JSON list of C-alpha atoms in Angstrom, two decimals:
[
{"chain": "A", "resi": 11, "resn": "UNK", "atom": "CA", "xyz": [-34.57, 29.32, -73.08]},
{"chain": "A", "resi": 12, "resn": "UNK", "atom": "CA", "xyz": [-33.61, 29.11, -69.44]},
{"chain": "A", "resi": 13, "resn": "UNK", "atom": "CA", "xyz": [-36.26, 30.48, -67.10]},
{"chain": "A", "resi": 14, "resn": "UNK", "atom": "CA", "xyz": [-36.43, 31.22, -63.38]},
{"chain": "A", "resi": 15, "resn": "UNK", "atom": "CA", "xyz": [-39.99, 30.79, -62.06]},
{"chain": "A", "resi": 16, "resn": "UNK", "atom": "CA", "xyz": [-41.14, 32.13, -58.68]},
{"chain": "A", "resi": 17, "resn": "UNK", "atom": "CA", "xyz": [-43.78, 30.38, -56.55]},
{"chain": "A", "resi": 18, "resn": "UNK", "atom": "CA", "xyz": [-45.60, 31.17, -53.31]},
{"chain": "A", "resi": 19, "resn": "UNK", "atom": "CA", "xyz": [-46.11, 28.08, -51.15]},
{"chain": "A", "resi": 20, "resn": "UNK", "atom": "CA", "xyz": [-49.43, 27.61, -49.34]},
{"chain": "A", "resi": 21, "resn": "UNK", "atom": "CA", "xyz": [-49.08, 24.78, -46.82]},
{"chain": "A", "resi": 22, "resn": "UNK", "atom": "CA", "xyz": [-51.91, 22.43, -45.91]},
{"chain": "A", "resi": 23, "resn": "UNK", "atom": "CA", "xyz": [-53.74, 23.40, -42.74]},
{"chain": "A", "resi": 24, "resn": "UNK", "atom": "CA", "xyz": [-54.93, 19.79, -42.20]},
{"chain": "A", "resi": 25, "resn": "UNK", "atom": "CA", "xyz": [-54.13, 16.38, -43.62]},
{"chain": "A", "resi": 26, "resn": "UNK", "atom": "CA", "xyz": [-54.81, 12.73, -42.81]},
{"chain": "A", "resi": 27, "resn": "UNK", "atom": "CA", "xyz": [-55.26, 9.34, -44.39]},
{"chain": "A", "resi": 28, "resn": "UNK", "atom": "CA", "xyz": [-57.88, 6.66, -43.90]},
{"chain": "A", "resi": 29, "resn": "UNK", "atom": "CA", "xyz": [-57.86, 2.87, -44.11]},
{"chain": "A", "resi": 30, "resn": "UNK", "atom": "CA", "xyz": [-60.82, 0.53, -44.51]},
{"chain": "A", "resi": 31, "resn": "UNK", "atom": "CA", "xyz": [-61.32, -2.94, -43.02]},
{"chain": "A", "resi": 32, "resn": "UNK", "atom": "CA", "xyz": [-60.49, -3.22, -39.33]},
{"chain": "A", "resi": 33, "resn": "UNK", "atom": "CA", "xyz": [-59.04, 0.31, -39.50]},
{"chain": "A", "resi": 34, "resn": "UNK", "atom": "CA", "xyz": [-62.21, 1.95, -40.81]},
{"chain": "A", "resi": 35, "resn": "UNK", "atom": "CA", "xyz": [-62.64, 3.78, -37.48]},
{"chain": "A", "resi": 36, "resn": "UNK", "atom": "CA", "xyz": [-58.95, 4.63, -36.96]},
{"chain": "A", "resi": 37, "resn": "UNK", "atom": "CA", "xyz": [-57.68, 8.21, -37.23]},
{"chain": "A", "resi": 38, "resn": "UNK", "atom": "CA", "xyz": [-54.21, 9.21, -38.49]},
{"chain": "A", "resi": 39, "resn": "UNK", "atom": "CA", "xyz": [-54.37, 13.00, -38.30]},
{"chain": "A", "resi": 40, "resn": "UNK", "atom": "CA", "xyz": [-50.97, 13.18, -36.59]},
{"chain": "A", "resi": 41, "resn": "UNK", "atom": "CA", "xyz": [-49.23, 10.64, -38.81]},
{"chain": "A", "resi": 42, "resn": "UNK", "atom": "CA", "xyz": [-46.06, 12.06, -40.31]},
{"chain": "A", "resi": 43, "resn": "UNK", "atom": "CA", "xyz": [-46.95, 10.50, -43.71]},
{"chain": "A", "resi": 44, "resn": "UNK", "atom": "CA", "xyz": [-50.11, 10.15, -45.86]},
{"chain": "A", "resi": 45, "resn": "UNK", "atom": "CA", "xyz": [-50.51, 6.56, -47.06]},
{"chain": "A", "resi": 46, "resn": "UNK", "atom": "CA", "xyz": [-52.14, 5.98, -50.47]},
{"chain": "A", "resi": 47, "resn": "UNK", "atom": "CA", "xyz": [-52.91, 2.52, -51.90]},
{"chain": "A", "resi": 48, "resn": "UNK", "atom": "CA", "xyz": [-55.77, 0.86, -53.80]},
{"chain": "A", "resi": 49, "resn": "UNK", "atom": "CA", "xyz": [-56.42, -2.80, -52.97]},
{"chain": "A", "resi": 50, "resn": "UNK", "atom": "CA", "xyz": [-59.00, -5.24, -51.60]},
{"chain": "A", "resi": 51, "resn": "UNK", "atom": "CA", "xyz": [-61.11, -4.56, -48.53]},
{"chain": "A", "resi": 52, "resn": "UNK", "atom": "CA", "xyz": [-59.04, -3.76, -45.45]},
{"chain": "A", "resi": 53, "resn": "UNK", "atom": "CA", "xyz": [-56.05, -2.58, -47.50]},
{"chain": "A", "resi": 54, "resn": "UNK", "atom": "CA", "xyz": [-57.22, 0.67, -49.15]},
{"chain": "A", "resi": 55, "resn": "UNK", "atom": "CA", "xyz": [-55.42, 3.85, -48.11]},
{"chain": "A", "resi": 56, "resn": "UNK", "atom": "CA", "xyz": [-56.60, 7.28, -49.23]},
{"chain": "A", "resi": 57, "resn": "UNK", "atom": "CA", "xyz": [-55.47, 10.76, -48.25]},
{"chain": "A", "resi": 58, "resn": "UNK", "atom": "CA", "xyz": [-57.25, 14.04, -47.56]},
{"chain": "A", "resi": 59, "resn": "UNK", "atom": "CA", "xyz": [-55.57, 17.45, -47.56]},
{"chain": "A", "resi": 60, "resn": "UNK", "atom": "CA", "xyz": [-57.06, 20.86, -46.68]},
{"chain": "A", "resi": 61, "resn": "UNK", "atom": "CA", "xyz": [-55.81, 24.31, -47.76]},
{"chain": "A", "resi": 62, "resn": "UNK", "atom": "CA", "xyz": [-56.85, 27.84, -46.77]},
{"chain": "A", "resi": 63, "resn": "UNK", "atom": "CA", "xyz": [-57.74, 29.83, -49.91]},
{"chain": "A", "resi": 64, "resn": "UNK", "atom": "CA", "xyz": [-58.38, 33.13, -48.12]},
{"chain": "A", "resi": 65, "resn": "UNK", "atom": "CA", "xyz": [-55.74, 35.85, -48.57]},
{"chain": "A", "resi": 66, "resn": "UNK", "atom": "CA", "xyz": [-54.86, 34.71, -52.10]},
{"chain": "A", "resi": 67, "resn": "UNK", "atom": "CA", "xyz": [-54.87, 37.43, -54.77]},
{"chain": "A", "resi": 68, "resn": "UNK", "atom": "CA", "xyz": [-55.36, 35.46, -57.99]},
{"chain": "A", "resi": 69, "resn": "UNK", "atom": "CA", "xyz": [-54.31, 38.45, -60.12]},
{"chain": "A", "resi": 70, "resn": "UNK", "atom": "CA", "xyz": [-50.68, 37.69, -59.15]},
{"chain": "A", "resi": 71, "resn": "UNK", "atom": "CA", "xyz": [-50.61, 34.13, -60.49]},
{"chain": "A", "resi": 72, "resn": "UNK", "atom": "CA", "xyz": [-50.92, 32.32, -63.80]},
{"chain": "A", "resi": 73, "resn": "UNK", "atom": "CA", "xyz": [-50.92, 28.71, -62.57]},
{"chain": "A", "resi": 74, "resn": "UNK", "atom": "CA", "xyz": [-51.53, 26.87, -59.30]},
{"chain": "A", "resi": 75, "resn": "UNK", "atom": "CA", "xyz": [-50.03, 23.47, -58.48]},
{"chain": "A", "resi": 76, "resn": "UNK", "atom": "CA", "xyz": [-50.44, 20.81, -55.84]},
{"chain": "A", "resi": 77, "resn": "UNK", "atom": "CA", "xyz": [-47.03, 19.61, -54.67]},
{"chain": "A", "resi": 78, "resn": "UNK", "atom": "CA", "xyz": [-46.69, 16.32, -52.78]},
{"chain": "A", "resi": 79, "resn": "UNK", "atom": "CA", "xyz": [-43.28, 14.96, -51.68]},
{"chain": "A", "resi": 80, "resn": "UNK", "atom": "CA", "xyz": [-42.88, 11.17, -51.73]},
{"chain": "A", "resi": 81, "resn": "UNK", "atom": "CA", "xyz": [-41.40, 9.88, -48.47]},
{"chain": "A", "resi": 82, "resn": "UNK", "atom": "CA", "xyz": [-41.51, 6.18, -49.35]},
{"chain": "A", "resi": 83, "resn": "UNK", "atom": "CA", "xyz": [-42.87, 3.99, -52.13]},
{"chain": "A", "resi": 84, "resn": "UNK", "atom": "CA", "xyz": [-43.18, 0.27, -52.74]},
{"chain": "A", "resi": 85, "resn": "UNK", "atom": "CA", "xyz": [-41.41, -1.76, -55.42]},
{"chain": "A", "resi": 86, "resn": "UNK", "atom": "CA", "xyz": [-43.94, -1.46, -58.27]},
{"chain": "A", "resi": 87, "resn": "UNK", "atom": "CA", "xyz": [-45.35, 2.03, -57.63]},
{"chain": "A", "resi": 88, "resn": "UNK", "atom": "CA", "xyz": [-45.00, 2.47, -61.42]},
{"chain": "A", "resi": 89, "resn": "UNK", "atom": "CA", "xyz": [-47.96, 0.06, -61.89]},
{"chain": "A", "resi": 90, "resn": "UNK", "atom": "CA", "xyz": [-50.47, 2.67, -60.68]},
{"chain": "A", "resi": 91, "resn": "UNK", "atom": "CA", "xyz": [-51.35, 6.35, -60.98]},
{"chain": "A", "resi": 92, "resn": "UNK", "atom": "CA", "xyz": [-52.58, 8.94, -58.47]},
{"chain": "A", "resi": 93, "resn": "UNK", "atom": "CA", "xyz": [-56.00, 10.57, -58.80]},
{"chain": "A", "resi": 94, "resn": "UNK", "atom": "CA", "xyz": [-56.34, 14.12, -57.43]},
{"chain": "A", "resi": 95, "resn": "UNK", "atom": "CA", "xyz": [-60.01, 14.58, -56.55]},
{"chain": "A", "resi": 96, "resn": "UNK", "atom": "CA", "xyz": [-62.00, 17.65, -55.57]},
{"chain": "A", "resi": 97, "resn": "UNK", "atom": "CA", "xyz": [-63.82, 17.38, -52.23]},
{"chain": "A", "resi": 98, "resn": "UNK", "atom": "CA", "xyz": [-66.53, 20.01, -51.72]},
{"chain": "A", "resi": 99, "resn": "UNK", "atom": "CA", "xyz": [-67.03, 19.10, -48.06]},
{"chain": "A", "resi": 100, "resn": "UNK", "atom": "CA", "xyz": [-64.55, 21.04, -45.88]},
{"chain": "A", "resi": 101, "resn": "UNK", "atom": "CA", "xyz": [-66.27, 20.19, -42.56]},
{"chain": "A", "resi": 102, "resn": "UNK", "atom": "CA", "xyz": [-64.09, 17.14, -41.88]},
{"chain": "A", "resi": 103, "resn": "UNK", "atom": "CA", "xyz": [-61.20, 17.48, -39.44]},
{"chain": "A", "resi": 104, "resn": "UNK", "atom": "CA", "xyz": [-57.81, 15.75, -39.55]},
{"chain": "A", "resi": 105, "resn": "UNK", "atom": "CA", "xyz": [-58.12, 14.77, -35.89]},
{"chain": "A", "resi": 106, "resn": "UNK", "atom": "CA", "xyz": [-61.46, 12.98, -36.39]},
{"chain": "A", "resi": 107, "resn": "UNK", "atom": "CA", "xyz": [-61.60, 11.84, -40.04]},
{"chain": "A", "resi": 108, "resn": "UNK", "atom": "CA", "xyz": [-61.82, 8.06, -40.47]},
{"chain": "A", "resi": 109, "resn": "UNK", "atom": "CA", "xyz": [-62.68, 5.83, -43.42]},
{"chain": "A", "resi": 110, "resn": "UNK", "atom": "CA", "xyz": [-66.29, 5.53, -42.17]},
{"chain": "A", "resi": 111, "resn": "UNK", "atom": "CA", "xyz": [-66.84, 9.30, -41.93]},
{"chain": "A", "resi": 112, "resn": "UNK", "atom": "CA", "xyz": [-64.69, 10.44, -44.87]},
{"chain": "A", "resi": 113, "resn": "UNK", "atom": "CA", "xyz": [-66.25, 13.07, -47.16]},
{"chain": "A", "resi": 114, "resn": "UNK", "atom": "CA", "xyz": [-67.40, 12.35, -50.70]},
{"chain": "A", "resi": 115, "resn": "UNK", "atom": "CA", "xyz": [-65.15, 13.03, -53.66]},
{"chain": "A", "resi": 116, "resn": "UNK", "atom": "CA", "xyz": [-66.94, 15.29, -56.13]},
{"chain": "A", "resi": 117, "resn": "UNK", "atom": "CA", "xyz": [-64.75, 14.65, -59.20]},
{"chain": "A", "resi": 118, "resn": "UNK", "atom": "CA", "xyz": [-61.23, 13.93, -60.39]},
{"chain": "A", "resi": 119, "resn": "UNK", "atom": "CA", "xyz": [-59.22, 17.06, -61.22]},
{"chain": "A", "resi": 120, "resn": "UNK", "atom": "CA", "xyz": [-56.06, 15.30, -62.48]},
{"chain": "A", "resi": 121, "resn": "UNK", "atom": "CA", "xyz": [-54.44, 11.87, -62.78]},
{"chain": "A", "resi": 122, "resn": "UNK", "atom": "CA", "xyz": [-50.65, 11.84, -62.51]},
{"chain": "A", "resi": 123, "resn": "UNK", "atom": "CA", "xyz": [-48.00, 9.19, -62.89]},
{"chain": "A", "resi": 124, "resn": "UNK", "atom": "CA", "xyz": [-46.11, 8.17, -59.78]},
{"chain": "A", "resi": 125, "resn": "UNK", "atom": "CA", "xyz": [-42.56, 8.94, -58.65]},
{"chain": "A", "resi": 126, "resn": "UNK", "atom": "CA", "xyz": [-40.37, 7.06, -56.17]},
{"chain": "A", "resi": 127, "resn": "UNK", "atom": "CA", "xyz": [-39.34, 8.04, -52.65]},
{"chain": "A", "resi": 128, "resn": "UNK", "atom": "CA", "xyz": [-37.25, 11.21, -52.53]},
{"chain": "A", "resi": 129, "resn": "UNK", "atom": "CA", "xyz": [-38.95, 12.61, -55.63]},
{"chain": "A", "resi": 130, "resn": "UNK", "atom": "CA", "xyz": [-41.67, 15.22, -55.94]},
{"chain": "A", "resi": 131, "resn": "UNK", "atom": "CA", "xyz": [-44.89, 15.49, -57.98]},
{"chain": "A", "resi": 132, "resn": "UNK", "atom": "CA", "xyz": [-46.29, 18.85, -59.12]},
{"chain": "A", "resi": 133, "resn": "UNK", "atom": "CA", "xyz": [-49.87, 18.55, -60.31]},
{"chain": "A", "resi": 134, "resn": "UNK", "atom": "CA", "xyz": [-51.30, 21.43, -62.37]},
{"chain": "A", "resi": 135, "resn": "UNK", "atom": "CA", "xyz": [-54.69, 22.28, -60.82]},
{"chain": "A", "resi": 136, "resn": "UNK", "atom": "CA", "xyz": [-54.90, 25.87, -62.03]},
{"chain": "A", "resi": 137, "resn": "UNK", "atom": "CA", "xyz": [-58.53, 26.02, -63.15]},
{"chain": "A", "resi": 138, "resn": "UNK", "atom": "CA", "xyz": [-59.64, 23.96, -60.15]},
{"chain": "A", "resi": 139, "resn": "UNK", "atom": "CA", "xyz": [-58.19, 26.43, -57.61]},
{"chain": "A", "resi": 140, "resn": "UNK", "atom": "CA", "xyz": [-58.89, 29.59, -59.66]},
{"chain": "A", "resi": 141, "resn": "UNK", "atom": "CA", "xyz": [-62.52, 28.49, -59.83]},
{"chain": "A", "resi": 142, "resn": "UNK", "atom": "CA", "xyz": [-62.71, 27.95, -56.07]},
{"chain": "A", "resi": 143, "resn": "UNK", "atom": "CA", "xyz": [-61.13, 31.33, -55.37]},
{"chain": "A", "resi": 144, "resn": "UNK", "atom": "CA", "xyz": [-63.38, 33.15, -57.85]},
{"chain": "A", "resi": 145, "resn": "UNK", "atom": "CA", "xyz": [-66.37, 31.41, -56.25]},
{"chain": "A", "resi": 146, "resn": "UNK", "atom": "CA", "xyz": [-65.45, 32.72, -52.76]},
{"chain": "A", "resi": 147, "resn": "UNK", "atom": "CA", "xyz": [-64.65, 29.20, -51.62]},
{"chain": "A", "resi": 148, "resn": "UNK", "atom": "CA", "xyz": [-62.55, 29.86, -48.53]},
{"chain": "A", "resi": 149, "resn": "UNK", "atom": "CA", "xyz": [-61.15, 26.34, -48.14]},
{"chain": "A", "resi": 150, "resn": "UNK", "atom": "CA", "xyz": [-60.03, 23.60, -50.53]},
{"chain": "A", "resi": 151, "resn": "UNK", "atom": "CA", "xyz": [-59.94, 19.84, -49.87]},
{"chain": "A", "resi": 152, "resn": "UNK", "atom": "CA", "xyz": [-58.04, 17.52, -52.19]},
{"chain": "A", "resi": 153, "resn": "UNK", "atom": "CA", "xyz": [-58.48, 13.74, -52.08]},
{"chain": "A", "resi": 154, "resn": "UNK", "atom": "CA", "xyz": [-55.52, 11.57, -53.06]},
{"chain": "A", "resi": 155, "resn": "UNK", "atom": "CA", "xyz": [-56.10, 8.01, -54.22]},
{"chain": "A", "resi": 156, "resn": "UNK", "atom": "CA", "xyz": [-54.45, 5.36, -56.36]},
{"chain": "A", "resi": 157, "resn": "UNK", "atom": "CA", "xyz": [-56.00, 4.10, -59.61]},
{"chain": "A", "resi": 158, "resn": "UNK", "atom": "CA", "xyz": [-54.65, 0.54, -59.68]},
{"chain": "A", "resi": 159, "resn": "UNK", "atom": "CA", "xyz": [-53.95, -2.29, -57.28]},
{"chain": "A", "resi": 160, "resn": "UNK", "atom": "CA", "xyz": [-51.26, -3.67, -59.62]},
{"chain": "A", "resi": 161, "resn": "UNK", "atom": "CA", "xyz": [-50.14, -7.16, -60.62]},
{"chain": "A", "resi": 162, "resn": "UNK", "atom": "CA", "xyz": [-48.03, -7.79, -57.49]},
{"chain": "A", "resi": 163, "resn": "UNK", "atom": "CA", "xyz": [-49.82, -5.34, -55.16]},
{"chain": "A", "resi": 164, "resn": "UNK", "atom": "CA", "xyz": [-46.65, -3.42, -54.25]},
{"chain": "A", "resi": 165, "resn": "UNK", "atom": "CA", "xyz": [-48.10, -0.07, -55.27]},
{"chain": "A", "resi": 166, "resn": "UNK", "atom": "CA", "xyz": [-48.54, 1.75, -51.95]},
{"chain": "A", "resi": 167, "resn": "UNK", "atom": "CA", "xyz": [-46.72, 5.01, -51.36]},
{"chain": "A", "resi": 168, "resn": "UNK", "atom": "CA", "xyz": [-46.54, 7.61, -48.60]},
{"chain": "A", "resi": 169, "resn": "UNK", "atom": "CA", "xyz": [-46.36, 11.37, -48.90]},
{"chain": "A", "resi": 170, "resn": "UNK", "atom": "CA", "xyz": [-44.76, 13.60, -46.32]},
{"chain": "A", "resi": 171, "resn": "UNK", "atom": "CA", "xyz": [-47.42, 15.14, -44.10]},
{"chain": "A", "resi": 172, "resn": "UNK", "atom": "CA", "xyz": [-47.63, 18.48, -42.32]},
{"chain": "A", "resi": 173, "resn": "UNK", "atom": "CA", "xyz": [-46.34, 16.54, -39.28]},
{"chain": "A", "resi": 174, "resn": "UNK", "atom": "CA", "xyz": [-43.24, 15.36, -41.15]},
{"chain": "A", "resi": 175, "resn": "UNK", "atom": "CA", "xyz": [-39.74, 16.43, -40.21]},
{"chain": "A", "resi": 176, "resn": "UNK", "atom": "CA", "xyz": [-39.10, 18.84, -43.08]},
{"chain": "A", "resi": 177, "resn": "UNK", "atom": "CA", "xyz": [-41.88, 21.46, -43.28]},
{"chain": "A", "resi": 178, "resn": "UNK", "atom": "CA", "xyz": [-40.65, 22.21, -46.80]},
{"chain": "A", "resi": 179, "resn": "UNK", "atom": "CA", "xyz": [-41.79, 18.74, -47.93]},
{"chain": "A", "resi": 180, "resn": "UNK", "atom": "CA", "xyz": [-45.31, 19.08, -46.48]},
{"chain": "A", "resi": 181, "resn": "UNK", "atom": "CA", "xyz": [-48.32, 19.16, -48.84]},
{"chain": "A", "resi": 182, "resn": "UNK", "atom": "CA", "xyz": [-48.71, 22.54, -50.47]},
{"chain": "A", "resi": 183, "resn": "UNK", "atom": "CA", "xyz": [-50.24, 24.59, -53.23]},
{"chain": "A", "resi": 184, "resn": "UNK", "atom": "CA", "xyz": [-47.62, 26.39, -55.29]},
{"chain": "A", "resi": 185, "resn": "UNK", "atom": "CA", "xyz": [-48.75, 29.73, -56.67]},
{"chain": "A", "resi": 186, "resn": "UNK", "atom": "CA", "xyz": [-46.86, 30.49, -59.89]},
{"chain": "A", "resi": 187, "resn": "UNK", "atom": "CA", "xyz": [-46.40, 34.25, -60.14]},
{"chain": "A", "resi": 188, "resn": "UNK", "atom": "CA", "xyz": [-46.88, 35.79, -63.58]}
]
């Protein structure tokens, strides 16, 4: 059939990315995109995103999604995938996180195929977030990283950040109402 599904958006309260190499001490907490790319030393980009889980009544919802909006993507973005990792450590801050102080990723919650600039990814992380809410976790950190460098290396992409123009394209959990 045709179906109309209703979602509540929960926007990230912090987000940044980190780069290794000479940039391993650089902060990007105000950057209006989150760069993600796997590659050799000095050219890795990984993203961190924080959400407030307080004031969420999980009895209203059947699924929970992470939505990232792709601002720009390189030529062969199809050659890699994106790992969505769970980060237990919520003590980092977007205005001080760097590659050298980034928190540890606990485990991979999902691996999704990429989409080009102007498209949107919607990653089902229902059990991940339901578990954190049931466990009285007040705050959720997701780590975004790329699985593959790729044959030609043109596999970097950038998501809209909370500091991007359109607040509707900022990182967000989507709460699917029952």
